[PDB]
C-alpha cells in the first residue's frame, strides 16, 4: 500500500465520495439493534474477563495451591 510520502494520484484529485441514501425506518431499527447487541456483548466480555482473572488468582494464591506448597515444604524438611 501507499506510504504517507507517496504523492496522491492525479485522477483522484477531483474525486468526491457521496454518502449513501438513508432509509429512516431501517436506520432507526438498526441503530437500536446495535445498542442492544453491543450491550449484551459487553456484559459477556465482562464475564469472560472475571473468569480469566479469577483463574489466575486461584492458580497464584488458591487454597489448593497454597496447600501443595506447604506439603512440599514439609516433605523437604
Amino acid at each position: 500500500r501507499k506510504t504517507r510520502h507517496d504523492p496522491l494520484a492525479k485522477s483522484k484529485i477531483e474525486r468526491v465520495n457521496m454518502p449513501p441514501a438513508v432509509d429512516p425506518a431501517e436506520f432507526f431499527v438498526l441503530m437500536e439493534r446495535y445498542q442492544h447487541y453491543r450491550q449484551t456483548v459487553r456484559a459477556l466480555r465482562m464475564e469472560f474477563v472475571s473468569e480469566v482473572q479469577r483463574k489466575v488468582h486461584e492458580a497464584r494464591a488458591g487454597v489448593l495451591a497454597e496447600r501443595k506448597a506447604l506439603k512440599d515444604a514439609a516433605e523437604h524438611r
Partner: protein, 193 residues
C-alpha cells in the same frame, strides 16, 4: 489380444497354461529390469503399453495379457503382498510399471475392504472412559421461556415500527438524501411460485 478370463479372472491362475508358465513361483520371479549401473532407478517406467503398443521388456503384469488385476483375483493380488508383514511391495521390488502398481494397490485395498483378502485387524481400546449419556450436551436441555412461548430469543430481533417523531428527525438530518421508507418486513420468506 482378447483373454477369455476377463469375466472370471481367477480362472487363469488355476488353468494348466498358468502352471506350465509360472508353476508355484510368483509371476514376477523371473523378471529383471534393464538399467545402467548397479543401483536401479527408484521409479519403474510409467507404462509398458503406449497407444496399444507394448515396450521391449514388458513388466510381469503387462507381459501376460491374461493376468487381470481385479479385486476378485485374490490369488494374483496375494503374490504382490508380503506374506510375513502384509505390506504391498513397492514397484521396484517386482518390476511392475507405475500404472500397474497403482492398479494393483487399488485392487488390493478393494479386496481388503470387501473381505476377500485377509489382513491384520488390530484390537483397539475404547474411545471414551465413561459411557454415561446423562450430560446436558447429549440429554434434553430445559426449554427457554422464549422458546416455549414462541417469541424471539431477544426482543430486538423482531421489527418494531419506529415512532413518527423519530422518523421526522432522520428526515430532517438526511434532507435530500432519503430513500423510500420501509414498512414491517414480510412475516415469512416468500417463494417463487
Amino acid at each position: 489380444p482378447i483373454s477369455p478370463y476377463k469375466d472370471e479372472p481367477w480362472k487363469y491362475l488355476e488353468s494348466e497354461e498358468y502352471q506350465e508358465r509360472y508353476g508355484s513361483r510368483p509371476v514376477w520371479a523371473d523378471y529383471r529390469r534393464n538399467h545402467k549401473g548397479g543401483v536401479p532407478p527408484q521409479r519403474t517406467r510409467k507404462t509398458c503399453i503406449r497407444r496399444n503398443k507394448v515396450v521391449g521388456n514388458p513388466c510381469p503384469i503387462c507381459r501376460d495379457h491374461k493376468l487381470h488385476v481385479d479385486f476378485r483375483n485374490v490369488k494374483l493380488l496375494e503374490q504382490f503382498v508380503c506374506a510375513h508383514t502384509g505390506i504391498i511391495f513397492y514397484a521396484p521390488y517386482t518390476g511392475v510399471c507405475v500404472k500397474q502398481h497403482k492398479r494393483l494397490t487399488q485392487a488390493i485395498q478393494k479386496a481388503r475392504d470387501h473381505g476377500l483378502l485377509i489382513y491384520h485387524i488390530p484390537q483397539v481400546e475404547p474411545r471414551d472412559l465413561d459411557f454415561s449419556t446423562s450430560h446436558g450436551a447429549v440429554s434434553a436441555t430445559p426449554p427457554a421461556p422464549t422458546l416455549v412461548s414462541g417469541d424471539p430469543w431477544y426482543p430486538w430481533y423482531n421489527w418494531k415500527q419506529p415512532p413518527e417523531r423519530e422518523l421526522s428527525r432522520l428526515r430532517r438530518l438526511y434532507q435530500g438524501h432519503l430513500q423510500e421508507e420501509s414498512g414491517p418486513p414480510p412475516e415469512s420468506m416468500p417463494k417463487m411460485p
